[PDB]
Structure formats: structure tokens, C-alpha cells
Amino acid sequence: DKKVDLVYMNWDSEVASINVLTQAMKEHGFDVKTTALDNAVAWQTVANGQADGMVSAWLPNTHKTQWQKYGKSVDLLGPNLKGAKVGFVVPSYMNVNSIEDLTNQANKTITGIEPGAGVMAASEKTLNSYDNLKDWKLVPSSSGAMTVALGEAIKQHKDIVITGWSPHWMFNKYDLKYLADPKGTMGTSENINTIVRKGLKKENPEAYKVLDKFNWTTKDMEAVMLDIQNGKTPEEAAKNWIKDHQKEVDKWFKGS
């Protein structure tokens, strides 16, 4: 009679993690309910005990507002994935290795995404902080347009500098690298965390123990995300990843 009620928000990262955790918990005999909700709504359901938890708490910056409102009302168990970040990214075949080393590559353009995006604010700050970038231009478009442009550039061995972020399937599809950011204007890393309702440890110790132990890496998430980007259903992408990492998955369901 094991059960668990999980909520997530509909981002490609979370679709990957929530299907792996769902398929894993089903395989270990849980009745699993999962529902996608708006970000603020998902947090409130966990804070009020309407849902058992979420594995989609991005801290400290991305969900800063929600953590300020609800953090003291939930149990933060800890990180399930470490090292999410943003930065300038280039194909690995380009020589440059640091943002301070850019000069005239790629038509002095940073190929960006939606104008309102957090990586885009950081990119603007970055262009106004590094002396060598004074004549460079941030060109917004969309996430889809950026990845199309990345693909075409790599196909033709052309220079391109994009506003990249991780985890993301592009790092599995292509051979890319982040440019060093010695001034730190592209920010520091975040972790994705697990939060549960306060009554869980006592009322549902079976689910609590699993959520407490759930963890995987940026490369694992990127592998699942690439399968989905290539047409596999999230359920099949997840089952395939689980099969290949059975030892790692089984760890979430045993031990003190």
C-alpha cells in the first residue's frame, strides 16, 4: 500500500526527472499520481500539504521568490541534481576558452534566446563588463531558433557563440564547451532540489525515504532529454535510462 502524490512544472528538465522518478517508484510498487502545475501553484500545494512533494526546486536564484514565500513551510530535503548553470557556449572545435579571449569570432554576435530570459540579462551585463566585448551585439530570438542556428553552424563548421544553459540536450547532441567567466557576470551554479510537505516524514515514511535519496547527474538528465527531443515518449526515455542505471536507481529504495 505504497503511494505518493508528486507535482512538477512543465519544463523539459522536469519532464525528464519526473518520468524517471515516476517509472522507478512504479517499478518498486508505488501508486504514483503526478500532475503538472504552474510554478507558484505547485509550490503552494506542497506548502499546504495538498501534494507530497516536488523534485523541481531550483535554488538559490531561479525559485528565490517561491523559497521566500514557502520555504519555512516545507521540508527541503536537499539537492537531487548539482551544477545547473548558464553561460556563453561554443562548439568545442573553436579555440577560444574564456570570455576575455573573444575578439572578432562569430561576427561579434552572441546568439541569444527569448529577450525576457534570465540568461539574457546576465549576457547583457556580461557584454557591458568585459572590455573586449564593447563592439559585440546580443541578438535575441527564441530557444528553438537558437538551437536551429547552433545545428546549422556546427554542420558547416562555422563559429557561433550562444547563450547556453545546463542541463540541456544540446550538450549530449553536440560537442560543446562553456567559456570561462573570470568576472563571474554569467553567475554561479544552482542545484535542483527536493522539497516535501512537513507531515510526510511521519505520515508517509515510505515515500519520504525515496524522495530523500532521489538523485542523478546533469549527464543523466541530458541523456533522457535528448531521447525525448528525438521522439521517444518521456515514459520510454525514462525506462531506458533506468534499465541502464539499475544499480543507481535501486539505491533510492533501500538503506537508512
Numbering used by the authors: 320 to 575
Task: Please give the exact wording used by the authors of the publication that reports this structure.
OpuAC was crystallized in the absence and presence of 1 mM glycine betaine, yielding an open conformation (space group P41212, diffracting to 1.9 Å resolution) and closed-liganded conformation (space group H32, diffracting to 2.2 Å resolution), respectively. In the open conformation, the α/β domains had moved by 25° relative to one another when compared to the closed-liganded state. OpuAC belongs to Class II of the proteins in the SBD family, with two connecting segments forming the hinge, of which the central residues are Lys404 and Ser508. In the open conformation structure, electron density was observed in the binding site, although it could not be unambiguously assigned to glycine betaine. Electron density was observed in the ligand-binding site of the open conformation structure. This density could not unambiguously be determined, but likely represents endogenous ligand that was co-purified with the protein, as ITC and fluorescence titration experiments showed that the amount of substrate bound per mol OpuAC was below 1. On the basis of modeling and refinement of the ambiguous density as glycine betaine, the initial coordination of the quaternary ammonium moiety would be performed by W377.
